[PDB]
Design an enzyme around this catalytic site. Structure first.
Site, PDB file in Angstrom:
ATOM      1  N   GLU A  48       0.906  -1.144   0.000  1.00  0.00           N
ATOM      2  CA  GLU A  48       0.000   0.000   0.000  1.00  0.00           C
ATOM      3  C   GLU A  48       0.942   1.190   0.000  1.00  0.00           C
ATOM      4  OE1 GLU A  48      -3.413  -1.374   0.150  1.00  0.00           O
ATOM      5  OE2 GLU A  48      -3.285   0.388  -1.129  1.00  0.00           O
ATOM      6  N   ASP A  59      -5.035  11.510   7.403  1.00  0.00           N
ATOM      7  CA  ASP A  59      -3.816  10.973   8.002  1.00  0.00           C
ATOM      8  C   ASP A  59      -3.410  11.629   9.318  1.00  0.00           C
ATOM      9  OD1 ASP A  59      -2.389   8.856   6.141  1.00  0.00           O
ATOM     10  OD2 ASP A  59      -3.080  10.403   4.761  1.00  0.00           O
ATOM     11  N   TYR A 174     -11.446  -2.479   2.104  1.00  0.00           N
ATOM     12  CA  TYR A 174     -10.673  -1.887   3.193  1.00  0.00           C
ATOM     13  C   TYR A 174     -11.558  -1.765   4.421  1.00  0.00           C
ATOM     14  CZ  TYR A 174      -6.984   1.048   5.326  1.00  0.00           C
ATOM     15  OH  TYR A 174      -5.983   1.611   6.094  1.00  0.00           O
TER      16      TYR A 174
END
Ligand SMILES: Nc1ccccc1SCCCCP(=O)(O)O
Ligand SMILES: Nc1ccccc1SCCCCP(=O)(O)O
Ligand SMILES: *Cc1c(COP(=O)(O)O)cnc(C)c1O
Ligand SMILES: *Cc1c(COP(=O)(O)O)cnc(C)c1O
Ligand code: NA
Ligand code: NA
Lengths: 264, 387, 387, 264
Positions: A48, A59, A174
């Site tokens: 990834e 993030d 995911y």
């Protein structure tokens, strides 16, 4: 069909997939290439990869700095695809997924961005800031270029989201371990979501967010997930050994060995 | 969704999957509130008895002497807090309360949205968390202290370029893991739906009051309404009630900074490229690679590196027109209003005045009924203009 | 004279013989203007469309929770310029114009009267001359620059203690040799007749609006109206319409500084001695010898070393009551309103709030309908309170 | 009746009166006493003395500094009356007038202030900031203590003011040469006012303000005035020679000789 084969192979081995995450060009292009090879050599099943963005809004601090370090090194999206081509030229079967932000893929045309992925040998693409509701053009472009569009299945998802993710997604689903952003700082009962996703013929689920210990990946596999994605725990090792590249590699090796073994 | 998230090509809901339920929730709360006469009277009461609504519409006579221009100014500088930003946060804070939320998250650059978010929360018993880029925190000691004195927690963001851009980032980052108890009070008519629609709706007073006001004083609608455009909230609030009035021109003014040619500006709608960022599809201060850039302007309040989707849309269909004004030009309009009218305008609004002043000066013999939205007070800029 | 220059023992016209015709002239201009429906509508228009009249009356709920006090605030902080001082100068500037005068002379300490005098002149085409003691000029860079940007000439007075006191001196000195073309815009409800009467009359809106406002919102007149007292203009403007309403208490609050006991205060009406100065007979900050002293206070705007004659008179007959509040006390009320109400009050007005806050706290079980005159905005004091 | 006699005597000599002004205690008590004796010795017919005030609102920069210098020396009103008693003990016939501000006379009672003047031997008192309209108590107190209340007759005065000044005033009428404040910086057709005042049996008129040259006092006398008052021109000499007390006196002498001679 790189993911198709990895998962089929991993199943014949009654094994779980361990997928580490890193930012392309962190701390430098050459050292980054070296890191990725170490990651593969120590046992990573798939990769990834994130290309440096100026506003990674999904993030946490660890990866925020990975982008900052990559930027400080002068890494660009063009330089990234160059890096991706070499990685594929070196490793033929390992699945490669890109962690992308919308603007970077919409910049010079959505279609043109996925053609580049196909050219470089990328396998999947997850655009962190595009929900299913807004994914039509990204999904379409990906499929057209034999790239699997990765969809995030959050822990709070209702039946309608689940049924959507299962139908559109490809490669792997995911599975979001937590709410919030990417961070090994906090940890994260995905049993029902995994059964439901399996029920809807979804792509094998990979659990991501907070996964930083060997016990965490074995737990992911036990619940019914095909594997686990780990990023901040990896990036934290790069952050730790900036003044010792050699130490970085050896430490990256021990960590991913411990992690892969836990999925067996 | 219950409403359309797009204005033609512009808008959308480009946020991680995780924040989608928080956006659908907010939208329903808005559609309900909007139809709620009890919410409507609560909001009208706060706007009136607390904020100062309705604000004045001032005819600037000295300024237009010797020309055929009749200029008026929507006095949003007289609103509590010194800017139009107050209308907005009051309605968004009541929406948070309607949603059972008791926490507010905020984004701020110049400090103005932060001060307004902080005051609204103090009044409505909400706990306020405010995010400001370190460069702005150091740069805005007065507003930071004003925010803290109002019971708000101020958090510096050292990430990236440490400005509005990265502040907006930490806000969403926080909101992803707290939307269940906290409401993110976005400071402009941009971002993911339902924000561009909510902010407009909660800033609509401006234009609605102006229409009635001009119809009273002049018995005619204006030839054109002008307003600066940072992210688009004060402008859209002015435009809204006049959109269906096709004889009224809508003019948005973007900062030109040191000159468009210099590349030192904050004019994305006109000289930037469409991209996807901050949960939106809109014109942007972008690098050739698609990296997000910063907007420059003498006035810190027009530093939003993007612009609202409704403006981009109105521009595209020809309904509204967008122009730009440089620093020296805004500095001139600032100076002029101080001396001939006795009103100290915000440098933000000075861009708007400067354009109306041009419209006059370039064609002094053209009969024209103009209305400039004085979105704010300029006491804040006395030091900047001084140096 | 056409009107009585005294309020009992207080008031008068203690100016050199030379300025008497300038005072009789002004008085006739006022009696005429007062009866002039054309002047009345011109003044009402400016107050409304230019200043922001009528200002709000805000119920402060969070502040009085847990007690039997219902508190309201007359929002003079929302008036153009950020203080009640604006009402006054507008009417005095029109009076100058009515008198064929085209020049304005002004006195200023904190800077507030100067900024208001400067803005009025800019709007009405009057040439403005402003006098400020050197100590205040250095001390008030922001207001000096605000004044100059508004086209006013600022003149430092190095004579004496170089403050309000000596500024008021240079003003009259100038006025003696220029009254024929210039009008001296006195900044408070003090000085020689006709000033205490003019300033009251031009500040009357405040109380008149409050009465109608409270009668609407509560169907009852207040138990007491409270206002700080520097020279007495905002206070008297609040009191005026309620003087004949004997059930309404009138409370004036004087600065206590570091403590009355310390002799470091600005409380002449209550702790000073009656003397004759500034063309008036009134209580004063005096030495034992009769030399004029300076008034001290955390808030620069309450530094007038004397007080209006009407207050001294209302006090003497028992109609109004005067009290004092110390710096720390005003600092506390300042801090409190910021956090529970989201309003940044001027430190001047904070003295007024502080007393209402006491009235509440000392007797939380007493049913009470209070109205505090928030004579001004506190952005000005963010730095002072900060340090 | 000190003024009565001076004017009668000056008339028998077909002469005009020259009256200089100074601030008591400027630059120091001892030097001030010395200045006053020099003023008298060089020919001054009468004296106009100011007691130091903190707010002389009818005074220009020259006298403003005289007050500042007197204050800097620690001179008080008590110290002034002490000074006045010695001056009277030294000079028995010279008329003495005080230039006063209202607060200084109202401070410890108006009546009590005039009793002090009588005790000290003061002849007149002019309260700069009290118009005729407000002089009732001051006038009354003065007359009661055999002190002459001095009234200012401005250049713009109408018949009513003139008739008032003539009736109330005593000693001498202070004829204002100019508008504005006390200053030798600017100069200043008093023919009609002087005839009118003479018509109403007013006290002999003394012209004050701007009078700083010998030619100015002769002009005052020619117009019908009984004399001229000069202050800033005198105070300017004190200001000039602060570092040379001896030079101050000699220069003060030459000036008042030139000035007195011009009235003869
Ligand atoms: N970076 C990112 C952002 C949004 C969605 C997926 C990813 S890829 C895997 C990130 C893993 C980081 P961590 O293990 O600290 O939770
Ligand atoms: N000081 C003063 C102030 C008001 C009224 C009279 C006097 S006494 C004589 C003053 C003369 C000063 P100058 O000659 O400069 O005009
Ligand atoms: C907050 C701010 C702006 C920027 O405005 P938007 O209306 O959202 O474009 C403009 N003017 C003032 C005075 C401001 O304070
Ligand atoms: C100017 C000033 C004052 C002093 O007031 P007076 O009303 O004449 O006593 C008080 N409050 C504020 C806010 C001021 O600016
Ligand atoms: Na913008
Ligand atoms: Na006072």
């Amino acid at each position: 069909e790189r993911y198709e084969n990895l998962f089929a192979q991993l199943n014949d081995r009654r094994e779980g997939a361990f997928v580490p995450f890193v930012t392309l060009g962190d701390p430098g292009i050459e050292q980054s290439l070296k890191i990725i090879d170490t990651l593969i050599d120590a046992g990573a099943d798939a990769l990834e990869l994130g290309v440096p963005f100026s506003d990674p809004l999904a993030d946490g601090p660890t990866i925020q700095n990975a982008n900052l370090r990559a930027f400080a090194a002068g890494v660009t999206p063009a330089q990234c695809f160059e890096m991706l081509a070499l990685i594929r030229e070196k490793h033929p079967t390992i699945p490669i997924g890109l962690l992308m932000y919308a603007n970077l893929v919409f910049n010079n045309g959505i279609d043109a961005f996925y053609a580049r992925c196909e050219q470089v040998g990328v396998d999947s693409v997850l655009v962190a800031d595009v929900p299913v509701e807004e994914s039509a053009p990204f999904r379409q472009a990906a499929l057209r270029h034999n790239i699997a569009p990765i969809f995030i299945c959050p822990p709070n998802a209702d039946d309608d989201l689940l049924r959507q993710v299962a139908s559109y997604g490809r490669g792997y689903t995911y599975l979001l371990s937590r709410s919030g952003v990417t961070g090994a700082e906090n940890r994260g009962p995905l049993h029902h979501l995994i059964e439901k996703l399996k029920e809807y013929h979804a792509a094998p689920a990979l659990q991501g967010f907070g996964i930083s210990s060997p016990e965490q990946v074995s737990a992911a596999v036990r619940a019914g997930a095909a594997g686990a994605i780990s990023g901040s725990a990896i990036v934290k090792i790069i952050e730790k050994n900036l003044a010792s590249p050699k130490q970085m590699l050896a430490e990256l090796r021990s960590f991913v060995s411990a992690m892969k073994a836990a999925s067996r | 969704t219950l409403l359309n998230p797009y204005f033609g090509e512009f808008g959308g809901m480009y946020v991680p999957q995780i924040l989608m339920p928080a956006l659908n929730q907010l939208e329903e709360a808005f559609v309900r509130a909007q139809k709620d006469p009890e919410f409507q009277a609560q909001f009208a009461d706060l706007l009136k008895n607390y904020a100062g609504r309705p604000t004045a519409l001032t005819k600037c006579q000295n300024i237009t002497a010797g020309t055929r221009t009749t200029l008026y100014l929507k006095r949003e500088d007289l609103l509590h807090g010194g800017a139009h930003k107050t209308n907005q946060v009051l309605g968004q804070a009541l929406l948070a309360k309607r949603m059972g939320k008791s926490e507010i998250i905020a984004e701020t650059g110049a400090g103005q949205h932060g001060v307004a978010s902080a005051l609204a929360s103090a009044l409505l018993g909400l706990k306020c968390r405010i995010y400001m880029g370190a460069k702005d925190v150091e740069r805005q000691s007065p507003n930071v202290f004003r925010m803290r004195l109002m019971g708000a927690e101020v958090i510096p963001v050292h990430s990236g370029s440490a400005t509005l851009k990265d502040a907006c980032n930490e806000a969403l980052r926080d909101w992803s893991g707290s939307y269940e108890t906290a409401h993110y009070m976005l400071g402009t008519a941009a971002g993911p739906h339902p924000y561009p629609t909510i902010v407009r709706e909660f800033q609509r007073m401006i234009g609605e009051e102006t229409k009635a006001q001009i119809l009273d004083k002049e018995g005619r609608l204006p030839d054109a309404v002008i307003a600066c455009v940072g992210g688009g909230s004060n402008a859209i609030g002015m435009f809204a009630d006049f959109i269906n009035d096709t004889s009224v021109g809508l003019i948005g003014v973007e900062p030109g900074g040191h000159g468009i040619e210099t590349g030192e500006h904050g004019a994305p709608l006109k000289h930037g490229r469409v991209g996807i960022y901050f949960g939106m599809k809109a014109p942007m201060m972008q690098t050739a690679d698609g990296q997000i850039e910063e907007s420059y302007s003498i006035s810190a309040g027009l530093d939003f590196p993007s612009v609202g989707p409704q403006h981009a849309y109105l521009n595209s269909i020809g309904r509204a027109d967008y122009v730009s004004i440089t620093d020296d030009e805004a500095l001139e309009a600032f100076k002029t209003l101080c001396r001939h009218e006795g009103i100290i305008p915000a440098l933000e609004s000075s861009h708007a005045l400067a354009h109306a002043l041009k419209m006059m000066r370039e064609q002094p013999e053209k009969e024209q009924l103009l209305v400039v939205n004085l979105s704010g007070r300029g006491d804040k800029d006395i030091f900047t203009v001084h140096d």
